[model samples]
Target: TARAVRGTKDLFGKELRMHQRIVATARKVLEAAGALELVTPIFEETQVFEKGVGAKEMFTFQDRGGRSLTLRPEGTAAMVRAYLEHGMKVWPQPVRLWMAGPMFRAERPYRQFHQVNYEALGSENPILDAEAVVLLYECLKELGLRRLKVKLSSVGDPEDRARYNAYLREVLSPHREALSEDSKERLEENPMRILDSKSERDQALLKELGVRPMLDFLGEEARAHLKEVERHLERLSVPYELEPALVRGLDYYVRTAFEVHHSALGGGGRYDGLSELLGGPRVPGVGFAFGVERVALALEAEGFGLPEEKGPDLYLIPLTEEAVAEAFYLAEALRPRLRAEYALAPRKPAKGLEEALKRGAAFAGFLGEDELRAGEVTLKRLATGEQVRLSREEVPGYLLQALG
Candidate 1:
């Protein structure tokens, strides 16, 4: 037997439908908000994901023609890359866009994940960030997920953050030997990220050092934006926490950095400084992507019912070989209005009905000699066991009313 690559598995049947519900429901919600669907390629130039914390995580490869490419680790950077490439700035003041697709990261055996990404580009409005927060909340809760909490934080604007960054370097410089290798690297490139370090030893070192989080350094503008977001969330009755250390360490990241927990979703924040670094003039953007698998697992964890895949709405049983042809024709006629499937070969009516019931169809239609002679079919309501005889032309409407 052929083996699937490590760390990846196929989704099908129930699992496939589970993903459909997540993506499709999210699409409907975002689409209604006037968010345009934007899809960039799964891979982009290596530098697109470079100059950031997770550069080592990029699944980089060179094409035969030698253009270095990288599988997208997250959607925000690529979305901005696309926004800059398409000249979207000229389109409108704030271009709202959404995308859902697979993303990759080269972690050990490598990994693959699906994500739903939303971006409001070309504007510095805080409402856009709030809108992203609310919709992300609404989509998951509306899908029946529980315990999904929103944690909001501010890394402050770049100038305020720069001062704090310098403070961190100064504070940690003498304790360099106590730092984890990765946190030490972050100290030089993105020191604020060290505040979120997961290493047990590194986490305790920061606490013992009595280091202050960037929240204390928020500039007036950053504080004002966070307050605005707080009031809006309150206005909408969306509860959230003020997490002081929840900072986005990327240099381009701005004021709002938020994430939803309990915990299929990842979060995003303001990236007002991103575009210019990529050579486009400064553009403000806020966006997010939540892992599809993460939410699906969350759904399962909450005991959210994954609806069973039902059989055809109507199963046709032909009593005679001759009736199979007639049943097939009748099924074709009925299908435009309802799902209809017919037995391939004539079988005893009892055996056929047994198969139909086991297959989980709602209604079973019998095309025996009596029905064929009368130019009608006998439809059985599988649940109530009620039988109704109707003309072939009338069957569609009759079933629809009965099913409803």
Candidate 2:
């Protein structure tokens, strides 16, 4: 059989089951919190990722169809497309929405991965940003990921920040030569990113290149919005550090932005203006993506225990070939009334019991030639090694009681 590509995954068997359970748990929490849930296609037009994520980033390149297609590096772009195409007009203002699915990215030829992303849509309002941040904080906290610290900033509305950028470019220009190659390349497009540059020279230059705090650059409305957002976070008792230079990869963000970081699990952040960048007519939206792999790794790091694996509650044992039909009928009939799994084992009763034990079944039901003739079956609880014989009609109630 063919295998999964490097950096990708073959999520099957028990691991897949556990992964799904985790995702379902997340969705349940999100929907209960008043956020609507949605899913969208995995593949999108290349331009969607390019314009929304970035047009010229590595791993976001053209595909063979010449469509400039890209595997989505994150979930926001696809959700934005859905929002514009079918959800925008129908979704309520401050439409709270959450999504979960596989996100793709090309990275160093072996760095691709998948994640379950939670998002809140239709709001440019800063309360939603803080709410989004708080949601992340609570969700992870519930999952036992504490000690989480948040880095907060305001990218400010693009229109309002234009002059600031112009000033920023000038300030950064004097030290342009001192910047590392990555900083030099990014300077032409998103100079603010140079704030996070790791190079010693860039770090030194960045330390001296301060102009005005982002709060000063924010227009009155934006200032109020960000203040209110911060206030809400404080009310929730979520700790955060305000880093004025916490600008992200995109150019369309406005007002508040934030990222969650935990010593245990890595975290993601809120990005606004994502919709407009995807060619949407409307602007002002924000969402965040959580890294599932990192969460799993964190769980392991913290010695967090996972639930034990379980198999079907009861395994149907057809001792003799002649009892197969009756065993089949019993399994089919018992399915609806009882939470048990009954199968006509391909092997003999003794061998079937061994198989059932190996599979971790809690009990085994024996349908022998004599039992079939007498309209009775023997059921044994594996845990206690207790066996009981029941008439055909009593099987359902017996299994039901056992399960209960």
Candidate 3:
């Protein structure tokens, strides 16, 4: 038997259903907000991630012709490329978009995940940032996720970031002996990343040193934008906490950035510089992505539990070999209106009914020689045990009414 990869596993049964429900709910919420759904390729030129994603953590490879390619590690980069290529900036002031799909990364294998990314491009409006946060909250709430807290922050403009980086370097210089090897490496290239570090020793050193918070380093414009985001979130009844050290693990993000958390459900933030970095004209954008698996885990932790699998609405039982053909035809006829399936081989009516019940079929339709001669089929409701006889012509409407 072939085993699944270390980080990836087959998703089916209740797990797949839970994942689909999450995607469906997100689609509904995003579509309701006039966000157009998009599906970019699973793979793209390696440079897309290099520029837009601003990260080295990706599954990259070379093709036979030696062209560099990578499985997308996130949705944002691909969408940015799409927006730029399609000339979407001319279409609207702010292009609202949504995407849900698998993302690949080459990190230490623990668990593979999928993301529902919601993005608003072509504007620097603070309300768009706040609206993205509120939309994520509403989507989760509609799915019965109640115990989420949004950790909010701002990285400020490029000037503010440069000043803060210098200040951060100065503060940590004296305590260089206490910093981790990776932290030491990032001190020069990306000092802000150290603030979001997971090392306990680094955190203790920073706390003991009493470093100045990044919030204090924000320029006037960035400060005003963050304030407006806060006001909108408050007005929208979305709860959030100000964490100055919440600089997301990306270089392109600027100004208002936030993450909604229930044990790391998911987060994203404003990346105003991303489009320009990807070779497009300057376009400010804000977005967030929720990890489907993480949200499902949170729901389970809260005792909400995953939903049960919904089997076909109807199962057809062909009593004889002759009826199998009729059942197949009838299944197709009824399918446009009802979720129907039929037996492929000859089986006893009792066996067919048993299989239908086992599969949680809501209604069972029986086609036998007698029924074929009479031009009628018997449909039974599994729950109430009520049977109705209808002509083949009337079966679809009858099932629709009964099922509905």
Q: lDDT of all the models against the reference?
A: 0.86, 0.70, 0.86
122: Cα error in model 1, Å: 1.6
Q: How many clashing residue pairs are found in candidate 2? A: 1
lDDT of 2 by residue, 260-368 (tens): 7764243444456666677667645666667777766665677776666767777787887777777788878877555456555446778878877987887888888
lDDT for 73 in candidate 1 is 86
lDDT head-to-head 1 vs 2, winner: 1
Poorest lDDT segment (10 consecutive residues) of candidate 2: 51-60
Provide the lDDT at 159 for model 1.
Answer: 94
If ranked by TM-score, best first, what sequence of candidates would result? 3, 1, 2
Provide the lowest-lDDT 10-residue window in model 3. 49-58
On residues 280-374, what C-alpha lDDT tens digit does candidate 3 reach at each position?
88988998998998888887888876646687889999998999999989888877667889989978878999999998999998999889999
**Can you list the residue pairs that collide in candidate 1?**
none
Off by more than 4 A, model 2:
52-68, 110-112, 180-182, 196-220, 263-272, 321-329, 336-355
TM-score of each: 0.87, 0.82, 0.88
* Model 1 C-alpha lDDT per residue in residues 133-196, reported as the tens digit of each score: 9988888887888787799988888899899989999999889889988888877887877876
Largest TM-score belongs to which candidate? 3
